């Protein structure tokens, strides 16, 4: 207590004003570890610390308290929150959940993301001054004034410390002034002094007429000494419930004294830990558990605007990603230009131009798929957490993501299409160049939407990548350049009818060979099926395919959960 920092402010600048929140659980019995006869009652102003086996597999106790859970879902007890039965609406309106893994954008500062969360949480009735005052009070409450302008970047970036990241996450989850606070392993991977400061901050937050629940596996001595209420959970069954300072006295009174120079929590955890020997230690924990019972707004448009602004601010500040994207785009453009260099004494032939167009059409989709899959899986967990928190109903989020990707997509298209039309010595003019540019832009946009749908459809990164590669190979083989687009009986014909690469190649052929007769244009278009659809028909088909892919992506976002 005397070895840690003592120059702090014990004042509370942002307290909870309202009725005291209550959380009462009566005979909780979870099934698929082995929670049997769990019952506790906490009120506002007390800090409940769940030590020991605070999990039931992949989901912790705080997850089943809030109603979540990755394992089973059958229940056998009752959960009373503020005098009302458990329900998703109540846990979403009153209960706040702070996960172990943070969800913060590295390209944003603390103040920016705090203002964004405040705008997405507070209703439309609150003016900008009220939101600014709330943000300032949240910053001053957690003592984040010395890092309000510094970035919150994760590893591989400067950012800030881990404790400051946890404080920023707490402020994000505490902006809408919740009544019940819940954190899952807040001091995981932090420094000892940092963990002590975080525990002191959580205790000060709980002291301001609030309810804070902490789940820790192996708490330290200084962490256990500051606990207000403690609940010993070993293999799902509770052993002790009350003050932390009285746990040693209760264990001495029940006939289990704590040895000198030994942590009480660790000793009481490893004393009743289950291992012939498994059944001998099971009756010991059940005897202590059985005896313990005998002694006792703002709107869709506003949310879309906030989301697109946050996405733009996060994308325009990612220097290495944009730099590597531009570098690879320039490399591909220079390769395409210098490989099919038409300027000189010898000009390009028909097969050379056809191969050049086919490569321009079917080389960028691979890198596009890779980049979109990476960008989707770098924030799938954050998106799932934001959807579970109850900010938006993923209605305008689709349009927000589309309008945030559109600038980067257009920039990449420009960078890839500038040094490729003049170096290859194609058909001169402005209208054919603009048509080729628009066709390439639409094809790459359709490929991006397909990648988004494939990422949102499959939760596994490797499985989604394999499915995207399979679709890319199916659309590549369906082109009118490899299998002549004539040897398709029933399946490849219908595959090419919906393959954007085939339509792209057909449009490029019809644009570059429009009334052109070269020595050894109309004959090759007659012998192939490229003349069966005019240019505007190809454009309409591409637009329809893009719309269908967007509809599929929206359906996958609305129905399929984005479980990490």
């Amino acid at each position, epitope marked *: 207590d005397r070895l840690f920092s003592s120059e702090s*402010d014990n004042s*509370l600048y942002f307290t909870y004003s309202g009725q005291p929140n209550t959380l009462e659980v009566r005979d909780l019995n979870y099934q698929v570890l082995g929670i049997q006869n769990l019952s506790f009652k906490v009120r506002s102003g007390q800090m409940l610390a769940i030590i020991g086996s605070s999990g039931c597999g992949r989901a912790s106790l705080l997850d089943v308290i809030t109603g979540r859970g990755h394992g089973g879902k059958i229940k056998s007890g009752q959960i009373w929150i503020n005098g009302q039965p458990s329900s998703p609406q109540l846990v979403r309106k009153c209960v706040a959940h702070v996960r172990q893994h943070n969800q913060l954008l590295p390209n944003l500062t603390v103040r920016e993301t705090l203002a964004f969360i405040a705008q997405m949480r507070l209703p439309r009735t609150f003016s900008q001054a009220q939101r600014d005052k709330r943000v300032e009070d949240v910053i*001053a409450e957690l003592r984040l*004034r010395q*890092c*309000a302008d510094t970035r919150v970047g994760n590893m591989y970036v400067r950012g800030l410390s881990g404790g400051e990241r946890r404080r920023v996450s707490i402020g994000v989850q505490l902006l809408w002034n919740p009544g019940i606070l819940i954190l899952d392993e807040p001091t995981s991977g932090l420094d000892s002094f940092t963990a002590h400061n975080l525990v002191k901050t959580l205790s000060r937050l709980a002291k301001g007429n609030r309810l804070v629940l902490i789940s820790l596996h192996q708490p330290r001595s200084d962490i256990f000494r500051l606990f207000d209420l403690v609940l010993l959970m070993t293999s799902g069954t509770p052993i002790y419930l009350g003050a932390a300072q009285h746990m040693v006295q209760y264990f001495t009174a029940i006939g289990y004294p704590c040895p000198r120079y030994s942590n009480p929590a660790d000793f009481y955890v490893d004393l009743t830990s289950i291992d012939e020997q498994e059944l001998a230690t099971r009756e010991k924990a059940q005897s202590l558990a059985a005896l313990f019972l005998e002694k006792v707004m703002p709107g869709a448009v506003q949310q879309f605007t906030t989301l697109i602004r946050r996405q733009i601010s996060n994308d325009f500040r990612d220097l290495p990603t944009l730099l590597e994207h531009g570098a690879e785009a320039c490399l591909m453009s220079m390769t395409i230009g210098f490989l099919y260099f038409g300027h000189g004494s010898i000009q390009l032939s028909f097969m050379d131009t056809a191969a050049l167009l086919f490569m321009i059409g079917a080389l960028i989709p691979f890198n596009v798929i890779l980049d979109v899959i990476s960008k989707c899986y770098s924030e799938r967990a954050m998106l799932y957490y934001e959807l579970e928190d109850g900010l938006y109903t993923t209605g305008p989020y689709f349009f927000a993501k589309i309008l945030g990707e559109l600038p980067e997509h257009c920039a990449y298209i420009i960078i890839y299409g500038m040094p490729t039309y003049w170096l290859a010595n194609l058909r001169p003019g402005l209208q054919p160049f603009l048509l080729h540019f628009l066709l390439v832009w639409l094809v790459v946009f359709c490929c991006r939407i397909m990648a988004l749908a494939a990422a949102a459809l499959l939760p596994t990164f490797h499985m989604a990548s394999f499915f995207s590669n399979a679709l890319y190979n199916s659309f590549y083989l369906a082109g009118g350049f490899m299998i002549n687009l004539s040897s398709l009986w029933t399946v490849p014909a219908w595959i090419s009818k919906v393959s954007f690469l085939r339509w792209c190649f057909e449009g490029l052929m019809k644009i570059q060979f429009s009334r052109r007769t070269y020595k050894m244009g109309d004959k090759i278009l007659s012998v192939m099926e490229l003349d069966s659809y005019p240019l505007y028909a190809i454009y309409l088909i591409v637009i329809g395919l893009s719309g269908g892919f967007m509809v599929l992506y929206y359906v996958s976002l609305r129905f399929i959960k984005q479980k990490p």
Partner: antibody, heavy 114, light 105 residues
Framework: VKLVESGGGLVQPGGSLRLSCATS????????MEWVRQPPGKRLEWVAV??????????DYSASVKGRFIVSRDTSQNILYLQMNALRAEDTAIYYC??????????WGQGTTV | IQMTQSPSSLSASLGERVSLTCRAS??????LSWLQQKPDGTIQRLIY???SLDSGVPKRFSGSRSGSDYSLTISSLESEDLAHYYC?????????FGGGTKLEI
């Protein structure tokens, strides 16, 4: 918002004196209460702070006067009090009565010579 | 956090643009306030957060920031500006003040 300081006079070293800070024009049970002094030849120095009702009217002092000064507030009359013990040695200043510190020192008082 | 305000004294006539410099020992992220102690004794805050102004404060007072050095620029000075200025920080506990600047006509 108006702040009026009172209780200044000539005292002996080791005696006792109590200052009065009148509050008017704002809610006394919703805002903080700060005590800032000023030596005749030095800069401003924060002395103590009186928290609002949300903090159970807890008090806090600086590392230089911790244990000798006692600050209290009257909710019925909206008057702040500061009990000063072992003064006239170095605590002689032009003590002012401030309202808020975390939100910027605004709406200062008049100040009296102790 | 030590607040070093420069210069210790400044003398100018009416109509010139005066600027006071205040440097913080650590990073406050723009949490700085400016005070005005009149010779009579009544102190009044002029600029808070180094960017905004209080109620009843004339528009001649402005605040700027250049890296880690905060500047209080006062243009079109009148005779009613003869007072002391103290810069303070409230981003880290405890709140410390500056050295001060005696602005005289």
């Amino acid at each position: 918002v108006k702040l009026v300081e009172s209780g200044g006079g000539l005292v002996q070293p080791g005696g006792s004196l109590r200052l009065s800070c009148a509050t008017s024009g704002f809610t006394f049970s919703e805002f903080f209460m700060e005590w800032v002094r000023q030596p005749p030849g030095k800069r401003l120095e924060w002395v103590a702070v009186s928290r609002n009702e949300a903090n159970d009217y807890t008090t806090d002092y600086s590392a230089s006067v911790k244990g000798r000064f006692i600050v209290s507030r009257d909710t019925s009359q909206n008057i702040l009090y500061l009990q000063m013990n072992a003064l006239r040695a170095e605590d002689t200043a032009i003590y002012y009565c401030a309202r808020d510190a975390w939100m910027g020192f605004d709406y200062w008082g008049q100040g009296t010579t102790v | 956090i030590q607040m070093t305000q420069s210069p210790s004294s400044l003398s100018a006539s009416l109509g010139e643009r005066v600027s006071l410099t205040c440097r913080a020992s650590q990073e406050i992220s723009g949490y700085l306030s400016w005070l005005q102690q009149k010779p009579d004794g009544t102190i009044q805050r002029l600029i808070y957060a180094a960017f905004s102004l209080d109620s009843g404060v004339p528009k001649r007072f402005s605040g700027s920031r250049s890296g880690s050095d905060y500047s209080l620029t006062i243009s079109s000075l009148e005779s009613e500006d003869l007072a002391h200025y103290y810069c303070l920080q409230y981003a880290s506990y405890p709140c410390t003040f500056g050295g001060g600047t005696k602005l005289e006509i």
